[PDB]
Design a protein around this nucleic acid. Structure first.
Lengths: 100, 98, 206, 79
RNA sequence: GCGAAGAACCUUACCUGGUCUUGACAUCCACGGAAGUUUUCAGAGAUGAGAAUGUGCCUUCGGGAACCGUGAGACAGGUGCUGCAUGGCUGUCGUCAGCUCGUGUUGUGAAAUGUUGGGUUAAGUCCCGCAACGAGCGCAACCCUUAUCCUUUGUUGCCAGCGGUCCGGCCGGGAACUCAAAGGAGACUGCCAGUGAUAAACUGGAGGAAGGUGGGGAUGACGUCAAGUCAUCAUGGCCCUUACGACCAGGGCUACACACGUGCUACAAUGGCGCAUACAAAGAGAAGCGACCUCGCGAGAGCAAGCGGACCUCAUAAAGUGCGUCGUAGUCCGGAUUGGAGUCUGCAACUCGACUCCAUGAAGUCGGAAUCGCUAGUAAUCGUGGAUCAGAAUGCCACGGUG
């Protein structure tokens, strides 16, 4: 695996643990509504242009045996062929293929 | 009043999992009906057919889930402890209905 | 090319698997590193045993070993209780109780691991490579088989260069996926060359 | 048209447009944010906008209500 | 309309300038510092550094070295050049019918004969006859599967039989049936009649849910081609190594003074429109499918369900049918506007997203030398669902109705 992808993983997971203060997560609660008509602001976002690339985007868990994103299945964490090969051996917890 | 359910991805692991909740109470309560089988359902699943770079074709991938209601009805605090000890077991899934 | 890796990608096809084990994917590399470690200390107490292959199964809280031998006496030792050493060399590495099964090899002069040994031990004795190669085929094809190939490399017959030469009888389906080919590469490792033999055996599909 | 019914000015542009009236004390100040929106508060000043290799001056018209700074800065050499 | 199944910064191989150069990853030498977190100044930012909060680990925190700064010095780095260095991965003639081992006979021999001839087929395939025979491989068969019974299940699904009974799966209950499975059966030119050489083969007939190798897959016989790919890759050379490495943003690459093959649709009235409406398959889901009621001319947002996926929720399928109205009219034809309003996700909706309301009504009166596709559950026609993911495709994947 390329250090360029590993360095972006090491950034993407660290921007998910940069801020903990209740102003840095204000976009989870300030666009909330109970009633319509007229503007509320015009510029209450006073500490929310300082964050960069911290919002949840492009999150991956990949093929957990090889680290590859290619052809992996979300319900197993394995490749679209390893889901047979490991079940033919009985390794997958609670699942078997052939001769059972 | 509680009801409990058991799920498995194999037609036989589900029976040795029933052995940890029904036959652990064979001397510790009233009788329990032999398990009603229920439908195994279609729920068709698909995968890309070649290991790499082919995308014009997709294969079927045949898998089914077994669901059992086990006829055991309302549990004692001991049968709840036996059920929560099966919630600690891998390869199967237990569910509670209220 | 088109020689591929018979001990790699082809070995999972129409054949029983030599390992089966589950682990948490966050430790998969360490449990793959121990799949080699439980062989490393074991194949030294089989050093004389003419074993074609070993199988190591790691179920939950258990480890179970099968040895496929041409010589069942030399693995059980005096009074037939010395077989427990094959448990004690792996149970001391895995930290769990280990089981042992000794399995008999049918026709040990038709098994690829052992035919390559029976050629290497002749090339170490400086015999004419074609004689050993042709006798290995004329023996195996009379014990059974639908075809067999042998390829010898290194110092052929007293040659001044490494070289490679082969011999084949019957059919050897190397490009057919279901062929159940039995394979091995061996090396003699001498002062005067590496001196290698490769063998491909075909007995029937699936 | 705006964004979410209000005008908005972030610190990186606010620190440029509150230094200008009408004419400043030095040259028109420089910016690269062509994705920023200009509103009726910025009326009557000159600002210098990047083109990708140099900067060019633009002046905020009295008819301003809402435009992106990348739309009216002379950038594309065409023919 | 294809390279490696979603493109704003992202990804990206380009250009301009930044922010760096033992780099991020790594082995390692010395010296002053624990390392992180929080925040201010400067920059848009990659960062340049203080100030506070702090002194962990092993150890006797004498000391040590992760780790941080700073220097030295072998170096680290690259979906860069190249299948014209390889291996692997596959691609192709092609489901094509043909390729070998032990052999016979013939010729000086290349090689032939057989494998030719008479019948025939999906096929060197099956037969007839003959100087050729056995044994193998591919084909077929084998393996996978579908059209329909039988037995097993029997629930919160189904409800015929049975005792109640506005007679309702509703209660007692039942296994009859759809449903969801696993097995057992069924298909073999096999049985019957013809033609033919009462051979093979072929066309009919019966049987059944249904054949005329039942249809579609799986293949890798002997071999062809130095096909594609350094792009998951692994790796020998080459190239760049304070950079062609990388990392932040702006210009963009959905560009435009040139030239076109190939797309796709309207131009009604055996009907449309308005109103009332019938009958689906394949699908999606407690980090989800999204309701009711409220508001908005609407996107959507509020208050916030139902359901464990049969029943809830997405979602009263459309064509079609009936009545009333319309009348080749630029129509109720047809379809882009320029202006103004919004609704949503996000470093960003300018060029260039999704989604919605109001009006403008241009072109089109059916298309040139010409040219295209399917022989039946098919052509055409009329509708339906989904994945990917912050947001974003009638492209991409799939199915029923009429036939």
């Amino acid at each position: 695996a390329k250090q360029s992808m590993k360095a972006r993983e090491v950034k993407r997971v660290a921007l998910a643990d940069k801020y903990f203060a209740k102003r840095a997560e204000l976009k989870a609660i300030i666009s909330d509504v109970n009633a319509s008509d007229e503007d509320r602001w015009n510029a209450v976002l006073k500490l929310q242009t300082l964050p960069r690339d911290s919002s949840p985007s492009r999150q991956r868990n990949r093929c957990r045996q090889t680290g590859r994103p290619h052809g992996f299945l979300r319900k197993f964490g394995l490749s679209r062929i390893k889901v047979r090969e490991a079940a033919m051996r009985g390794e997958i917890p609670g699942l078997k293929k052939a001769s059972w | 009043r509680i009801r409990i359910r058991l799920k498995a991805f194999d037609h036989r692991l589900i029976d040795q999992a029933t052995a940890e909740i029904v036959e652990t109470a064979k001397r510790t309560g009233a009788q329990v009906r032999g398990p009603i089988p229920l439908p195994t359902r279609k729920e068709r699943f698909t995968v890309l057919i070649s290991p790499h770079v082919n995308k014009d074709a997709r294969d079927q991938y045949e898998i089914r889930t077994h669901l059992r209601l086990v006829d055991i009805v309302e549990p004692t605090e001991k049968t709840v402890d036996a059920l929560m000890r099966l919630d600690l077991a891998a390869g199967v899934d237990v569910q509670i209905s209220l | 090319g088109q020689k591929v890796h018979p001990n790699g990608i082809r070995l999972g096809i129409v054949k029983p698997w030599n390992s089966t084990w589950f682990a948490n994917t966050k430790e998969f590399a360490d449990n793959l590193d121990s799949d080699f470690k439980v062989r490393q200390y074991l194949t030294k107490e089989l050093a004389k045993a003419s074993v074609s292959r070993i199988v190591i199964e790691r179920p939950a809280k258990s480890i179970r070993v099968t040895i496929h031998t041409a010589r069942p006496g030399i693995v059980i030792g005096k009074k037939g209780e010395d077989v427990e050493k094959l448990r004690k060399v792996v149970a001391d590495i895995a930290g769990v109780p280990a089981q042992i099964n000794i399995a008999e090899v049918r026709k040990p002069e038709l098994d690829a691991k052992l035919v390559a040994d029976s050629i290497t031990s002749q090339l170490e004795r400086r015999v004419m490579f074609r004689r050993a190669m042709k006798r290995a085929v004329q023996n195996a094809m009379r014990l059974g088989a639908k075809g067999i190939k042998v390829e010898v490399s290194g110092r052929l017959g007293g040659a001044e260069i490494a070289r490679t030469e082969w011999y084949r009888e019957g059919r050897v389906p190397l490009h057919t996926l279901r062929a159940d080919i039995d394979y091995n590469t061996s090396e003699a490792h001498t002062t005067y060359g590496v001196i290698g033999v490769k063998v491909w055996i075909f007995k029937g599909e699936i | 048209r705006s964004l979410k019914k209000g005008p908005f000015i972030d610190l990186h542009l606010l620190k440029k447009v509150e230094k200008a009236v009408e004419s400043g004390d030095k040259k028109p100040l420089r910016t690269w944010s062509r994705r920023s929106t200009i509103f009726p508060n910025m009326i009557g000043l000159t600002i210098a906008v990047h083109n990708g290799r140099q900067h060019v001056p633009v002046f905020v018209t009295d008819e301003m209500v809402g435009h992106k700074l990348g739309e009216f800065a002379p950038t594309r050499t065409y023919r």
